[PDB]
Each structure stands twice: as C-alpha cells, then as structure tokens.
Design a protein around this nucleic acid. Structure first.
Length: 126
RNA sequence: AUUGAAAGUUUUUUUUUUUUUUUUUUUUUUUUUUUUUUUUUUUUUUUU
C-alpha cells in the first residue's frame, strides 16, 4: 500500500518526517458563540460557548519525505488548488490552508557530497 | 585493554464532532415667522 509505505505503520519503517509549526506570534482572540432555540429565535440560556482562534497568514512547516512518491506530488498538487482544513471547528470556518507555489520551496538530495539547493516550489509541482 | 561485548524504547494514532451573541427598544415632548411704517409731496385744462 503506498500510503503505508509513505507514512509508516505499526511495524513499517515510515518514510516521512514532519516538523511542527511553532509561531513566535501569540495573537489570540476569542470568538464567542450562542445557540438559538429553533422553536423560538432566542439565546438558549443553558451555556455560552466560547472558542479561541489563532489568527495567522503564513504557517511555515518543514516536511522531509524519504520516498520520492508521485503520491506526494499529487497530494501537494491537490493542496495547491482545492486545499484542506487543519485544526478543530473546521466546519465553522476555522482553519483552511492552501499551499502556494511562491513562498514554499523544496530541495531534492541525491548526492551526499554537495550542499542542498532550494528553489521555487512551482518548478517541482508545475 | 573493566568478568565483557552489541543493540535508538522505537515504532503507529489529526484533540475531532454538536452550537447564528440571539429576542425585545418609533431620537420624540413642547414653541403662531411677528412687530412698529398713510403709496405721500410738488403742478390753475389750458393762448395769437
């Protein structure tokens, strides 16, 4: 299965290493919510849902893949146009990322005697 | 040249779903555009 060969399994080696995306920015705002009684349009005095939200514009994540799979290229291509959601309450307009081909960059390493070179992601993906 | 040694605590798992800051609330109630001022004065229906 290509998916297992890429992401690993209970006994499989793996193949992909993903770093986190810690952001020095800590701009955190609060977006409260209320439930409306369907029988009568008013606030249901049972709870006051309150949800945090981390506003951001560019999420930088470093990803290393040890399997030059056309599956990976196709996944990145799908993220280029359609784009998927990340994080909770994605059904409520919270979290929707789209990969760009301008800021993001890649690098292919085949020789271990040369310094890796980064170039625009468009050349790799387009 | 330790009795003596050589093994990554590693793989694998999205903190996710349910929820409209909503209903009610007429920028109105009152206040006379009035108030003092003469369309007045001067002029022969008239001569060789």
């Amino acid at each position: 299965c290509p998916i297992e060969r890429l992401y690993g399994s209970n006994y499989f080696a793996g193949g992909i290493t993903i770093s986190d995306s810690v952001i020095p920015n800590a701009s955190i705002m609060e977006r409260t919510h209320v439930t409306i009684e369907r029988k009568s349009k008013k606030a249901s005095e049972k709870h006051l849902f309150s949800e945090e939200i981390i506003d951001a514009e560019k999420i930088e994540v470093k990803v290393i893949v040890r399997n030059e799979f056309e599956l990976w290229k196709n996944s990145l291509k799908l993220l280029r146009e359609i784009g998927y959601f990340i994080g909770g309450s994605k059904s409520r307009g919270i979290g929707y990322i789209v990969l760009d081909e301008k800021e993001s960059e890649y690098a292919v390493i085949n020789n271990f005697s040369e310094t890796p070179k980064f170039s625009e992601l468009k050349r790799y993906l387009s």
